[PDB]
Design a binder for this molecule. Structure first.
Ligand code: BOG
Ligand code: BOG
Ligand code: BOG
Ligand code: BOG
Ligand code: BOG
Ligand code: BOG
Lengths: 299, 299, 299
């Protein structure tokens, strides 16, 4: 039975592909890199999808248990999210298939959150100790992804609806998360999910940049400032994060890193803090590269 | 002694009147509908005002008790709020009386919040269990209403001050509310007040649209996205909300619904997501219609 | 051994100097006032710096203890903050020295927050009772100050990064703070730090106005509305704040007051709510004047 969190791997790859895609006109070779990443991401995605279908068929009670858990349910959101990203990738070759995947991912994530998260407002199941970074996945990241993907297909206003849902849900959840981390923190086996704390700002700004045609304005800059603050915090925290050793869970970081890379390209195109953008692009690529090496070593 | 929450009924009606008012030039008959609602709202308001004056005279200790409660005090805010809305209505016939009611409502709500809510920051009276949706009424809804009403009279910058107070107070309160609902939720007899959770975004966007002359921009769209997210959540939660049976408390929903309707008209005028706007207008009207039928049945 | 909080005194003075500086072209004499304040602030700053160096040399374990405390550490942030403000002042005479102080303050505050605040996310040291207004100093005020100071030197985009970090950190911290004040509040000896609750909006809008060349737009007005709401709340709370008597801790208020004054000038220049701006300027000056009188009386 495939661990649901493993969908984090094509996610990272997929998102990195998109970042590279935006560098084509400045640097033709980028296209190749993008294509390669795209294909690899897509491949893994297919595989995992198949594996997950098998899970649904044989290990269904496992799926049901992770679904009902007020903590683990969030990772199921990785499935429509990656679906959408693969859509994005496939758009460069076949827009129709892409659109199909994007609508499936969007409807899927909306249905999922509606059911499960509202259910959380019923009370008594979610605990203070359930306040985990993974909660950003159904609540926030899925909506940003829908916003960017819909923008890709030319549904910009719709995109703005999903973007708004994402951004405000982000601002509404993060306060209690950070208070919780200050007071009880996390057990070590959860510590890698701290990586997800890096994602919101960057994913936010990426989605934002996708909807407003890459215009780097005041909001984008603001979002970047908070993003880099969170990056410095997590960098200083990293030895503590990996106190009990390196693991595959570190793939959490990938989503934020990839988004950082993506947003970096827009900042570069608009000639805004180009040195910072180059540093961000390179740093995120190196880090995800190390994740890939680590992962191959384990395999 | 009149239950203070009953002011929720003219509130709903009043707000719906305003929504219909904005459809006059597109659909002359709307004016009639608006007028009718206006008058009815105004009528009930007068009645309730009179009843409340009587309360002040004879059941004063009851008023004092609801005032001192860290939970029930919030409903008193319904009185200046509805005052203002009646002002809005009456503006179509007599701007001077309207202005009088609007300033009375504005000063009243500001005084009320200053005294009572700051007092809450003194500590020791408010409890974790006091974290109720009703708190949005003095903290958030009253300021949005002041903003829109002041905008009506041409005091736009002042309007922006109240709008800002409302929006930021909203974002500052909602995180702890939603964490609380996730963990302990609410006893059934409070569950109808979940309806108030629908209001902020829509009331926000309505106020915003009133101050910026109905221009549908990026902020308005964002606000709508979060509004509809909350709507879907509450729709899925509705059987749970009315688990112990239908009641008059369901009038909570009305404020959000009416605002949804109101904002829908601006979206329709600006040709933004017109299908969505029509659906929102119709849905909110049908729902408030059902509230009215239910209410007459009880009477 | 100098109490670290004493850096609040030149801070206030420094910030007030800057406010007066902006009134020169409208009122030549303002320049003199500004200059005087500047010099005085600078003088005290030097003194305190020297004293603090001595602290580092002889009472180091005291410094270490305040550093490790999840409550008292925040006041150390007053040192880079005031450093920057003195930079601002000195800019009118010598831009190079100013730039040196500004970069020292900026790097210092960033390093400080990175280390200490991230460390807080490690868990187990910070308690619910550690949720104090003073936390705004490293998390929020330092970044706003960096943003405005950097804007002064012409690094506007960089300024936007720090501004964004500040604003979003503000919105992310305040919800749990205000819930905490509602439930357990503060012991009397901490109550003066309630003054810091006045600062964020005003400091925010000041920084914002510095980066966007004094243009009073919708964001600025919004920020002001919330600022004045918090002012009214604190005014009503003031007798409770000083229940156990007047003290030097009241210098907390100064930062907010000075910023109010500063932002007032921009509002005055842009002809936006000029009556309100005059009232704000005068009120803040009178209040800080009273702080100065009180302080001299104690000396
Ligand atoms: C942003 C991308 C998120 C990275 C996903 C990797 C999360 C690995 O982490 C683990 O995942 C498991 C799910 O399979 C969970 O059951 C565990 O609770 C979690 O710790
Ligand atoms: C989480 C809170 C984020 C605040 C978003 C701030 C948006 C800033 O808004 C800015 O206003 C300017 C007016 O001078 C315009 O010129 C810019 O285009 C606009 O983006
Ligand atoms: C947005 C409009 C709010 C709807 C008001 C209906 C609230 C009904 O609800 C009840 O109201 C009573 C006040 O009379 C309170 O004492 C009760 O606590 C509350 O449950
Ligand atoms: C709660 C946080 C809400 C964030 C509000 C986002 C405001 C978006 O700001 C937008 O900036 C654009 C610049 O491209 C302008 O063109 C738009 O007019 C402006 O509204
Ligand atoms: C915005 C400016 C902040 C005002 C600083 C005055 C704070 C006085 O207050 C005291 O300061 C001491 C630090 O010396 C702390 O140890 C105490 O906890 C605190 O109460
Ligand atoms: C904390 C959340 C703050 C929300 C910031 C709202 C920014 C409002 O954004 C405004 O959009 C307008 C479009 O009509 C533009 O004309 C204004 O310049 C822009 O500032």
């Amino acid at each position: 039975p495939l661990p649901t969190g493993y969908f984090g791997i094509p996610l990272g790859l997929a998102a990195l592909s998109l970042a590279w895609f935006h560098l084509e006109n400045l640097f033709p070779a980028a296209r190749m890199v993008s294509d390669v990443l795209g294909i690899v991401a897509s491949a893994v995605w297919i595989l995992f999808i198949l594996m997950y279908a098998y899970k649904l068929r044989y290990y269904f009670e496992e799926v049901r248990a992770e679904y009902h858990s007020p903590v683990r349910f969030s990772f199921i959101a990785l499935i429509p999210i990656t679906t959408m990203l693969v859509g994005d990738i496939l758009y460069r070759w076949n827009p129709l298939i892409a659109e199909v995947l994007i609508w499936i991912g969007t409807i899927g994530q909306l249905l999922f959150s509606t059911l499960r998260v509202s259910e959380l407002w019923q009370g008594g199941v979610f605990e203070q100790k359930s306040t985990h970074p993974s909660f950003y996945l159904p609540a926030v990241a899925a909506n940003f992804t829908s916003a960017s993907s819909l923008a890709l297909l030319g549904y910009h206003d719709l995109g703005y609806l999903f973007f708004g849902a994402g951004m405000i849900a982000w601002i509404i959840f993060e306060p209690v998360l950070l208070q919780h981390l200050r007071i009880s923190s996390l057990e070590p086996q959860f510590r890698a999910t701290m990586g997800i704390v890096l994602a919101p700002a960057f994913v936010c700004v990426s989605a934002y940049l996708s909807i407003n045609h890459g215009e780097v304005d005041t909001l984008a800059k603001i979002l970047w400032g908070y993003g880099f603050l969170q990056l410095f915090f997590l960098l200083r925290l990293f030895p503590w994060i990996v106190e009990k050793g390196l693991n595959i869970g570190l793939w959490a970081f990938s989503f934020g890193l990839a988004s950082m890379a993506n947003s970096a390209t827009a900042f570069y195109h608009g000639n805004v803090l180009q040195g910072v953008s180059i540093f961000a692009f390179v740093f995120s690529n190196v880090m995800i590269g190390l994740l890939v090496l680590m992962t191959i070593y384990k395999l």
